[PDB]
Amino acid sequence: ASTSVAASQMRNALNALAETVPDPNERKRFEAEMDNFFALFRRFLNDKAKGNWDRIAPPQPSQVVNYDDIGKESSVEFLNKLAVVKLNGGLGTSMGCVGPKSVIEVREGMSFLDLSVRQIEHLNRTYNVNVPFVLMNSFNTDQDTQSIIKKYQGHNVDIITFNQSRYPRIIKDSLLPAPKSFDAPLQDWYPPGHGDVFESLYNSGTLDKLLERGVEYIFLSNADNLGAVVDTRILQHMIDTKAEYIMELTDKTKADVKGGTIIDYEGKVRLLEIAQVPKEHVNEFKSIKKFKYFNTNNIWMNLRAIKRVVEENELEMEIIANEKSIPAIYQLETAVGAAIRHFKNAHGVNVPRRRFLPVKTCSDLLLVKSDLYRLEHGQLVMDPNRFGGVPVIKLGSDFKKVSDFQKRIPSIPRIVELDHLTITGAVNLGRNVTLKGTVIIVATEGSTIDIPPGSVLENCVVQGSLRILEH
Amino acid sequence: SDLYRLEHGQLVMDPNRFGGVPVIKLGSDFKKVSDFQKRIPSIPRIVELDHLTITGAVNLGRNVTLKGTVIIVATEGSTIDIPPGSVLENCVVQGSLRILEH
Amino acid sequence: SDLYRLEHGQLVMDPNRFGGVPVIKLGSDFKKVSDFQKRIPSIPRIVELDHLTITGAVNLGRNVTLKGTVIIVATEGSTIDIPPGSVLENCVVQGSLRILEH
Amino acid sequence: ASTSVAASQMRNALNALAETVPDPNERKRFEAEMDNFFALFRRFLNDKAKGNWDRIAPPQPSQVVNYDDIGKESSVEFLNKLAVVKLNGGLGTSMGCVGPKSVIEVREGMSFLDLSVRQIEHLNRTYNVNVPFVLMNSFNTDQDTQSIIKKYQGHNVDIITFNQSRYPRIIKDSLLPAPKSFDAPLQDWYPPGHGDVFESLYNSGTLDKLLERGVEYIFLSNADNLGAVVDTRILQHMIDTKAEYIMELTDKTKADVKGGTIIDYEGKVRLLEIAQVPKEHVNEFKSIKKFKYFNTNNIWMNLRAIKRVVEENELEMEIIANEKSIPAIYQLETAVGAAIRHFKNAHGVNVPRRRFLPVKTCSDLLLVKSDLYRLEHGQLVMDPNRFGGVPVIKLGSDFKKVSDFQKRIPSIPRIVELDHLTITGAVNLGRNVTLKGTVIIVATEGSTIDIPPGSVLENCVVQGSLRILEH
C-alpha cells in the first residue's frame, strides 16, 4: 500500500514543481521530462519488490564480427549522411581540475575537445565534406562551454550544443524530490545516464537540426577515448548490413576482466556488469573464458532508428541506482550499451586496441605526453618501431591530482624500450631521464628520492632517499 | 680521466681547459688503490668541473658527468649509488640510494 | 610449486594456466640452495600469480597465496615475516615484521 | 628379502663385537644386552615393512580413580616394603649447563638430587624407617655422579647406583653398529629409553639388592619433577587394589594438549602420542573432548611383578626411532608409560596438579626461585594465600642458557599478585621489582630496557629503550 501512497505523494510533488514555472515552453519540456521519472520511479519501487546465471549463456560465434573481415573503405559520398555525437558531461573535478574535463589540456596545450574538432577538420579538408559534430553537454559545463567554444569560430566547423535532461534529486527517506521551486539550486539536481541521449536529441530539437541536413548515420563516443577517430571503413559495414546498432568491441586484457560484457541472451544480445551479476557467480564471471569481450562504448547508430524508438516509446532502460549525501539522495542512471537489445540486426564488431586508450587517471596522462606518441593532423598513432603492447605504468597515491603532477615531473621521461614501471612515495624525476627494461622505485616512508638528471636506469630496483639542493 | 691525453708518452693538458686543475678530495674510504677499482669502474667526465668532494660510501656508475661544483655527503654507514648517466650541475647530494639488479 | 605435476617422470604444466610462465626474481640473499630451505619451508601457491619480486630478508610462512602482482621490498637490514595463510592481491609490501613464539 | 639380509649382516656385526671382549663378566652382560637389540632390530625392520583411529576409543569411567576418593593414609608398618627408583640420565647440556642435570642448583644452592634425599631423610626421621632410594644413572653422568654422591656420606641414607644399558649407535645407511672395538668412543653409543629400567634393575643385581631388604612396592618418578614427593596415601590404594601398575594422571591444561594420553583399547589400557596418532586425526585428537588425561610419568609398581615380566619375557615395548648426526644414525627408545598394557589390574589415578611441576626450561626456574614457594624440610608447598593457578611466565629467546639468566635477573622479582608476564628482547630487571596484574614488556629490536630498581608495575604495556649507567 505504501508504494501507492508514495507514488501519490511523488506525483503531487512532481506536479507541484510543474505548476510553479514561469514559462509554457519550460512547462512542456519539464512535464514530459518529469513524467518519465514518475514511470521510472514506479518501476524502481516495483522492481525492488519483484527483485539469471542460467540465462547467462556465452556469446555465439554469429554475434561478433572481426575488424579484419570488414571490406574496403566507404565512398566519400556516403559521409554526408554520417553524424558524430559526443558525451560532454564530465567535469574536471574527477581529476581535481577546474571546469569541464573536455577543456583540460593533454599535449602541447591542446584540449581533448580540440583534437576532436581537429579530426573533423581533417575529414573536411581531405574530401570537402562537412560531418556534423554534436556535443551532449551538461548543466555543469554549458556555462564554461558556452565561453570556450567561441575559440572555434571562423573555421569551417558546424558546432551545435544542447543540455541534457535536468532531473531533481530524490530524498532517500521521504522518496520525494528535494527541490521545491523551479529555480532551486544545482545541488538539488543531477545529470541522468547516457541513455538520455536519444530523447534529449529529440526534445532539444537537435534531431530536427540533424534531420535538416539529411544525416542518416550517427556515431557516439566518449570525449575521454582519444582513439575514437572516424574510420570510413566501419561505415561501409554499416551501409552493407544496415544494422540499427553496431558496437565496437575489444578483447579483454588483464586489466579488462572487470567492466561490461556482451551476452547473447537467446539472440537478443544483451550486456551485464557487477551491478547485476550474482555474487555467487562473480568469480565465475571473472574467468577469462565465456566472457572474452567488453564494451568499448564506441557505438554506431541510425538516426531514424533513434527517432522510431522514441516515436514508438519502446525505449526502456536498465535503471542504475547511485547515492550521494547533500551537506541522502538517490540517482537513476543508464548505460550507453544497454540499448543494444531493442535494435534490429544489432551485432558487434571487435576492433584492434589502438581504438581504446582512455584518460581516467594520472597513469594515462604520462603515456600520452611522452615521446612514444606523435600527433599527425590530430590523430595519435603509436611509433611503428615499438615492439609489443603498451608499457604498464602505475604511479603511487601521491600523484592523484593533476596540478601536483607538473611539480614532480617537469619533463616527461623517455619511455621507449621501457617494459614496466612502478613508483611509490615521493619521487622527483629530473630532466632527460631514460628508463630501460623494468624499473622499480620505492621511496622510504616520509623521505624523498630525487632521481639525478640524465640518469639511465636498466633492469634495477631503487630504494632510499636522496636530496638535491642548489649549491 | 678524459682531461689528459698521451702523446708519445708525454702528458699535456687539453688546451680547451680554462683555469687551473680542478680540486678533487676523496674521503677516507678510498685509501687503498685496490678498492678504488671497485667504487669507480669508469672514470667520470671531469671537463667543466670546478670542485668535487666525496665523503662516505659513494659508488659512481658509468658515464657520470659532473659540472660546476658537486658535493656528495653519504649518510654514516649507508651507501649512495649514483645512477648511470647522471648529470650533476652545481648541487649538494645527501642520503642513501641502493641499486640492485632486478 | 603446485604449478607442475609429475606423471611417470614427465613434467607438463596444468592446462588451466593461461599465458606463459609467471616471472619470479628473488633477491641476492637467496643465492645458496641450502639457505633456500630456511626462508621458504613450504612453497607458496603460485597459481593465478602474474609477477613476483622479492628483495631483502623475506620469510614466507606456510600456505601463503599470491595473486596478480606482488612486490616485497624489505627495509635494509630488517626482516619481513609474512604471516601464515596470507593472501596477497595486486599490492606493494614494504617494512619490517617479526613473529616470535609466545 | 632385504630385511633378512640386513638382519643377517646385523647379527654378524653384533656378534663380532660381542666376540671381541676382554672379560667374561662383560661378555655375559654384553651378550644378553646385545642379543636384546637383535630382537628389537628385527621387529623394527618387520614393523617398518608392515607399516587405528577407529580403535582409539575414549577411556571408560572404570579406568580412572580420583585422588579425592582414595582412603586414609597407609600405616607406617606397610612402608618397609616400598621402594623409590629415579631416572638419572639427564645431562645439563639440555640447558647449557655442565655436568648432569641432577647436579644443577634450583634454590638456595641445593641441587635437584639434594631435595630428593632430603625428602627421604624427613620420612625416615619421622617414623624410623629406611626406604631404599635407587638411582638409574647413565654413562654420561656416572663419572660426575660418582664424585658428587660422596657428599651424602654419613647421613642415614642408603644410596645405590648402577648404569643402564649402553647400546651402540646403528649406521643409517649400512644398518650396522657404528662401533667396531670394545673400547670404542662414547659417540658410538647412546642410552636407551626409560623402559630399560625393568631389565637394568635385574641385570645389575639391584633387584637382588632390593629383594635382599624385602621391598615389595616400587615407585618411579623423574628427577626433574620436584612434585613427586612420597605420599603414604597412594600406597594404601595400592595395598588395597594390589594392582600391578598404577600411573598418576592429571587433567590436561591448555599447555598439555600435546603429550601422551591413556586409551582404554578394549579394557587393555594403553597410551599413544603424536609419534603414532594419524596425521589426519591429530587435530581431532587435540580436541579437549575424548582425551582429557595425560601421562605424568609418576608410576607405582610391584617389584615381584617386574621380576615376573622379566622372568616370563612378557616385557614388550613400543619402539621409538630417533635420529642423530655424528660429527647419520638411528636410536631405539621406549616410554615409561607404555608398559601399562602387560600388567594385571593396571589402572590410573588422577592427582591434583601440585604433583606436576617440571623444570625443563627457563620459564620454570623463575617460578621456583621466587617468593611464591617456600621449602619445608625439603618439600615445596605453595602459599595458601595464592588464589587461582600458577601465573604464566614466558621469557623470550634471549634467556635460553641458564648461565646468562643470572646476568639479566640478579634478583628474582616479587611475583605475588602477578597474573601474566611476557618478556621479549633485552630486558634487565633491577632489584626489588614488583609486578602486579598483567605486564607486557617488548624491547625494541637490538636495544635494551633497564627496568629501574623498585619499579612497581600494574596492568600495563612497556615498550622502548632505557639505559642506566653509573654516574
Numbering used by the authors:
A (entry chain C), D (entry chain H): 32 to 82, 86 to 361, 371 to 514
B (entry chain F), C (entry chain G): 413 to 514
What did the article's authors report about this structure?
UGPs catalyze the interconversion of UTP and Glc-1-P to UDP-Glc and PPi in a Mg2+-dependent reaction, following an ordered sequential Bi-Bi mechanism in which the uridine compound is the first to enter and the last to exit the active site. Each AnUGP subunit (57.6 kDa protein; 514 amino acids) is composed of three domains: (i) the α-helical N-terminal (NT) domain (residues 1–81, 199–227, 354–376), (ii) the catalytic glycosyltransferase A-like (GT-A-like) domain [residues 82–198, 228–353, 377–404 (29 - 31)] containing the active site, and (iii) the C-terminal (CT) oligomerization domain (residues 405–514) containing a left-handed parallel β-helix (LβH; residues Leu461–His514).
Endogenous native AnUGP was purified owing to its ability to bind a Ni-NTA affinity column without any added tag. To take advantage of the particle’s apparent symmetry and increase the resolution of the cryoEM map, we refined the data while applying D4 symmetry, resulting in a 3.98 Å structure. Afterward, a restrained local refinement, focusing on this single subunit, yielded a 3.5 Å cryoEM map for the AnUGP monomer with local resolution ranging from 3.0 to >6 Å. Accordingly, we present a model for residues 32–82, 86–361, and 371–514 of AnUGP. The cryoEM map of the LβH region shows high local resolution (up to 3.2 Å), allowing the oligomerization interface to be described. Two AnUGP subunits build the homodimer through “end-to-end” contacts between their C-terminal extended β-strands, forming an extended intermolecular β-sheet and a joint β-helix. The UDP-Glc binding site faces toward the inner cavity of the complex with four pockets each in both the upper and lower rings. AnUGP displays a strong preference for UTP and, accordingly, in the structure, it is evident that the presence of small residues, Gly123 and Gly124, in the NB loop is vital for reducing steric clashes with the uridine moiety.
